[PDB]
Design an enzyme around this catalytic site. Structure first.
Site, mmCIF file in Angstrom:
data_model
loop_
_atom_site.group_PDB
_atom_site.id
_atom_site.type_symbol
_atom_site.label_atom_id
_atom_site.label_comp_id
_atom_site.label_asym_id
_atom_site.label_seq_id
_atom_site.Cartn_x
_atom_site.Cartn_y
_atom_site.Cartn_z
ATOM 1 N N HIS A 1 -4.908 -9.418 6.733
ATOM 2 C CA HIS A 1 -3.574 -8.964 7.111
ATOM 3 C C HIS A 1 -3.181 -9.382 8.527
ATOM 4 O O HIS A 1 -2.001 -9.348 8.891
ATOM 5 C CB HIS A 1 -3.490 -7.440 6.994
ATOM 6 C CG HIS A 1 -3.502 -6.941 5.564
ATOM 7 N ND1 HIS A 1 -2.478 -7.176 4.708
ATOM 8 C CD2 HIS A 1 -4.437 -6.211 4.904
ATOM 9 C CE1 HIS A 1 -2.761 -6.599 3.522
ATOM 10 N NE2 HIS A 1 -3.926 -6.027 3.628
ATOM 11 N N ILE B 1 -5.914 -1.214 14.463
ATOM 12 C CA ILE B 1 -7.180 -1.545 15.113
ATOM 13 C C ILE B 1 -6.940 -2.395 16.369
ATOM 14 O O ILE B 1 -7.756 -2.397 17.293
ATOM 15 C CB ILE B 1 -8.150 -2.276 14.145
ATOM 16 C CG1 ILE B 1 -9.565 -2.371 14.754
ATOM 17 C CG2 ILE B 1 -7.605 -3.645 13.756
ATOM 18 C CD1 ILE B 1 -10.231 -1.015 14.931
ATOM 19 N N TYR C 1 0.815 -1.203 0.000
ATOM 20 C CA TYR C 1 0.000 0.000 0.000
ATOM 21 C C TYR C 1 0.857 1.264 0.000
ATOM 22 O O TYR C 1 0.582 2.228 0.723
ATOM 23 C CB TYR C 1 -0.961 -0.008 1.194
ATOM 24 C CG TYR C 1 -1.876 -1.225 1.241
ATOM 25 C CD1 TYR C 1 -2.801 -1.464 0.234
ATOM 26 C CD2 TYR C 1 -1.808 -2.128 2.291
ATOM 27 C CE1 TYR C 1 -3.641 -2.573 0.277
ATOM 28 C CE2 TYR C 1 -2.648 -3.243 2.343
ATOM 29 C CZ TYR C 1 -3.560 -3.452 1.325
ATOM 30 O OH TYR C 1 -4.399 -4.551 1.355
#
Ligand SMILES: Nc1ncnc2c1ncn2[C@@H]1O[C@H](CSCC[C@H](N)C(=O)O)[C@@H](O)[C@H]1O
Ligand SMILES: C[N+](C)(C)CCOP(=O)(O)O
Length: 258
Positions: A124, A103, A11
């Protein structure tokens, strides 16, 4: 570490822009807006609802959920560069928040959200961390709340071939079966757990995307490079082949707190 790995490889800014070309504006996962409309077709929310999007990416899901329902949407993504892109695509809307955070370390109040939503992000996470996350999700949901997930899954690891093993290893994904995934939700005491193997649907989405890529190759090459075209083209070819035979799978999960 996890963060650095994702930001510097899969990313990167350029990596996300390549993905966005084939997935659709504001999306980094298959089917873009059209799939999102289908996934949310039986979800009821309104202007007073609170929504968490785990792995919010470029923000397309949050934008749609806020547009369709008027709900408060809070997106969490670990990649700071992606969150920066997402924040540039929304203005003047105090009911859409995008935040850069892992998170797994983020704190939310217990009984906070009407919907916890995640699309193509939890792949992931390590298996230990998937279980930890869904325990947190259980706490974070309101008593009346819903969990809604789509994710990359796979056949049992024993069945993987050389090419798929290498793909999973290089991506650093943890891919489990649809069935193992549902069992984690059940073990976390979620109720009304529904799991769907939607690999055939995913295959259809991938084919549309592949066709789009080929038909817009000239446009793609203006933006990127032939090297990136070849990587995308070969990547989608493999996913089409492996979804057809269910080696790589696309899982849907819905559950409730009570
Ligand atoms: N531990 C973690 N915490 C928060 N986000 C994470 C994470 N691990 C991976 N992610 C995020 O998961 C996202 C996967 S891409 C999918 C984005 C969006 N849901 C869409 O469908 O378009 C990435 O943006 C990545 O940064
Ligand atoms: C995982 N994802 C769907 C967010 C992005 C695409 O990943 P990949 O299909 O190139 O492995």
């Amino acid at each position: 570490s996890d963060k650095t790995f994702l930001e510097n490889n899969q990313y990167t800014d350029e990596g996300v822009k390549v993905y966005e070309f084939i997935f659709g504006e504001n999306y980094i996962s298959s089917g873009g807006l059209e799939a999102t409309k289908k996934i949310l077709s039986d979800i009821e929310l309104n202007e007073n609802s609170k929504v968490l999007d785990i792995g919010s990416g470029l923000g397309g899901g949050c934008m749609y959920i806020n547009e369709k329902y008027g709900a408060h949407t809070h997106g969490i993504d670990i990649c700071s560069n992606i969150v920066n892109m997402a924040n540039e695509r929304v203005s003047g809307n105090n009911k859409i928040i995008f935040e850069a955070n892992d998170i797994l370390t983020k704190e939310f109040p217990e009984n906070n959200f009407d919907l916890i939503y995640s699309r193509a992000a939890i792949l992931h996470l390590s298996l230990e961390n998937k279980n930890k996350l869904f325990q947190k999700c259980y706490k974070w949901l309101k008593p009346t709340g819903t969990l809604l997930i789509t994710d990359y899954c796979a056949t049992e690891k024993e069945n993987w071939d050389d090419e798929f093993k290498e793909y999973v290893k290089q991506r650093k994904y943890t891919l489990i079966t649809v069935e193992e995934y549902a069992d984690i939700l059940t073990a976390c005491n979620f109720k009304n757990v529904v799991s769907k193997d939607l690999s055939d649907y995913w295959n259809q989405l991938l084919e549309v995307e592949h066709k789009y890529l080929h038909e817009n190759k000239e446009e793609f090459l203006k933006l990127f490079s032939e090297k990136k075209f070849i990587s995308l083209d070969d990547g989608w070819s493999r996913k089409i082949k492996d979804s057809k035979r269910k080696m790589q799978r696309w899982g849907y999960f819905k559950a409730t707190k009570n």
